Design a binder for this molecule. Sequence first.
Ligand SMILES: NC(=O)c1ccc[n+]([C@@H]2O[C@H](COP(=O)([O-])OP(=O)(O)OC[C@H]3O[C@@H](n4cnc5c(N)ncnc54)[C@H](O)[C@@H]3O)[C@@H](O)[C@H]2O)c1
Ligand SMILES: NC(=O)c1ccc[n+]([C@@H]2O[C@H](COP(=O)([O-])OP(=O)(O)OC[C@H]3O[C@@H](n4cnc5c(N)ncnc54)[C@H](O)[C@@H]3O)[C@@H](O)[C@H]2O)c1
Lengths: 291, 291
Amino acid sequence: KIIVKHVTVIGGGLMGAGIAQVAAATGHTVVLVDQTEDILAKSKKGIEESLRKVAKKKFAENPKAGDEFVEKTLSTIATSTDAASVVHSTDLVVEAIVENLKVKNELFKRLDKFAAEHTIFASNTASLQITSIANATTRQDRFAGLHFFNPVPVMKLVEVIKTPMTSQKTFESLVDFSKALGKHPVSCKDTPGFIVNRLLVPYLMEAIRLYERGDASKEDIDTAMKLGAGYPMGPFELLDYVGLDTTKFIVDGWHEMDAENPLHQPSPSLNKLVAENKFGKKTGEGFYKYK
Amino acid sequence: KIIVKHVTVIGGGLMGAGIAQVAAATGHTVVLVDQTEDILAKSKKGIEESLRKVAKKKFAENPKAGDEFVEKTLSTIATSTDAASVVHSTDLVVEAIVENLKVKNELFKRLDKFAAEHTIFASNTASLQITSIANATTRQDRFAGLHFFNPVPVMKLVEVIKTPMTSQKTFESLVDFSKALGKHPVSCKDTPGFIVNRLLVPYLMEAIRLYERGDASKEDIDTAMKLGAGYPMGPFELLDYVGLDTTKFIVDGWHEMDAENPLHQPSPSLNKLVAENKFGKKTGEGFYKYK
Ligand SMILES: NC(=O)c1ccc[n+]([C@@H]2O[C@H](COP(=O)([O-])OP(=O)(O)OC[C@H]3O[C@@H](n4cnc5c(N)ncnc54)[C@H](O)[C@@H]3O)[C@@H](O)[C@H]2O)c1
Ligand SMILES: NC(=O)c1ccc[n+]([C@@H]2O[C@H](COP(=O)([O-])OP(=O)(O)OC[C@H]3O[C@@H](n4cnc5c(N)ncnc54)[C@H](O)[C@@H]3O)[C@@H](O)[C@H]2O)c1
C-alpha cells in the first residue's frame, strides 16, 4: 500500500483549487494543472486569497504566524499546464475538469501512459460513471472516485468511490489520504449521485414541484425546512447556492438514463431560469435576487 | 376577527401535551381533554416535569419565580374526560388524537353540535385530508389544519393548512394564535404530507432504499448527510428518532392512495423492524440499538 505524498490536481477551478489548497495545507507536495498560465495564475491568487482569510482567523493573534502559514502552503503548490509532464513521479492524480466524459477519458488515456506504476487516478466527477472513465485506461485497479464538496476548504466530507475493479490497496490509500487531508471518508458503489447528491438533488426537485403545483410559496417552504427539519438552508436558498445550472445538468442526466422515471421529470421553473441565465448566487440571481 | 384565548386541546399524548403546555405557557387558558383520568394525570405530570426542567435552567438566580412560573402555567391547564362539555364557550379546538381518520371525524362531528358559533376547529394530523375531516361538520369555514412538530415546546414551526372552504378570517386567526404561542407559521394547501413531512419522509425512504440496495452502509449514509449536507442527524438516526412504525403508517397511507408512485413503495427492512417492534429510540432498538 502506497502513502500519498505527491498529488497532481488537474483543474484549477472551484473544486480543484479547493482540493489543491487542502492538500498543500496538510503537507502534501502539490502540482496544480490547468489549460493556461493565465488561468493557473488566477487560481493560485484565489487559493492565496482563500488562505489569508483562513490565516487572519486561525492566527488572529499573531499576524506573522498567519503569514508564514500562507507562504509555506502556497509554496508547496507548483503549477503546470501539461499534467503529463509531472505525473511520472506523482502518487495520486485528482481530476476535476469539465464534467464531460469524452474529455476526461481522453485525459486519463493519455496520462495513463506518463504516470508511474504506483500512481492512483481519482475523478471528483459529480454525475458520470467512475467505471466508465476508469475503462479509458488499463489501470482500473488503481482507479476510483474521490468526490469532495464545495467549498472544499470547509466541507469535511469526501466520498471514496469504488468501481468493481478498484483494488483494496487502492481504496485504503484513498481513505488514508482523505484522513490525512483532515476529511472524513465514506464508501459508496459506483452509482449515480453516490450518496449526498442521490439523496439531496431529488429532494430539491420535489421542493420545486410543491412550489410549481402552487401548494406553497418558496419563502414558506424554505422556512418550513429550516425550522421543522433543522436544515441550514431552505431548498430554494440551497438551489441558488449550488447552482441551478449544475442541478439542471445533473437531473437531465438521470432523466436521460431513465425517462419513464417520474423522479427526474424536468422542471419548467428550473428550465426557464436556466434559460434566463439566472443561475443563482453565481450570477447574482436564481430563484432569489442577490447583491 | 377572532382572538384565541381559550383553547381546548383534545388528546394529551406526545403532541397534545406539548400544545397544551406551549398554550398555557404563553397565557392561553387551556382545557386538556383525553379518554381517561389516569391518562390525564400522567399527561399533566409530564408537562410539569418538563416545565421544571426549564425552570431549573432559566430561573437559576431567582428560584422563587421559577416555581411561580411552573405553578401558574400548570393551573392554567384544566382537564376533562368529556370534550362536549368543554367546547360550549371555547375559542379554538386543536385536535391531536389517534391518527385513524375515522375516530377523528366521529369526534369532530359530535362536537360541531356543542361548540359556540365563533369557535374554530383544527386538526394536527400529519397525513390526512383536512377536508375529509372538515366535511364531517357544517363548520367548514371554521375548520383548518394546525400542524405542530415534536417536541412542540422546542420546534418553532407551525403549519397552518387551509382548505378551499376555510375562511380568510379563520386563517388570519390561526396565524396570530401561532405567533402568540411563540411559533412561526407557514401556509400550505391540504396536500398530503403538507410541506415538511411531504419533503422529509420520501427522502428518508430513499436513504433506506440506497441501503437495501447494498450501495453504502447505514453509518456512512448518516455521516454523508451530516457532513455533506449539514443535516443535524442522519436519515437513519432521524428515522429511529421519529419512530419507524410512525414513518411506515405514513408511507403506507400515501402508497394506498397512489399504489403506483415509486416514491411510496413499502420497504422490506422497514417492514421487518416495525414487525419486530423495534420502532427506534422509543424501544431501545430500531435501525440502531439504544439506551
Ligand atoms: N460545481 C460544483 O459545485 C461541483 C461540486 C462537486 C463536484 N463537481 C465536479 O467536479 C469537477 C470540477 O468542476 P468545477 O466546478 O470546479 O468547475 P470549474 O469550471 O470551476 O473548473 C474546471 C476547470 O477545468 C479546467 N479544464 C477543462 N478541461 C481541461 C483539460 N483538458 N485539461 C486541464 N484542465 C482542464 C478548466 O480550465 C477549469 O478551470 C466536475 O467534474 C464537476 O462535475 C462540481
Ligand atoms: N409523531 C409525530 O412526530 C407527529 C408530528 C406531527 C403531528 N402528529 C399528529 O398529532 C396527533 C398526535 O399524535 P401523538 O403522537 O401525540 O399520539 P399519541 O397516541 O401519543 O397521543 C394521542 C392521545 O389521544 C388520545 N385519544 C385517542 N382517541 C381519543 C378520543 N376519541 N378522545 C380523546 N382522546 C383520544 C389517546 O389516549 C392519547 O393520549 C396525531 O394525529 C399525529 O398524526 C404527530
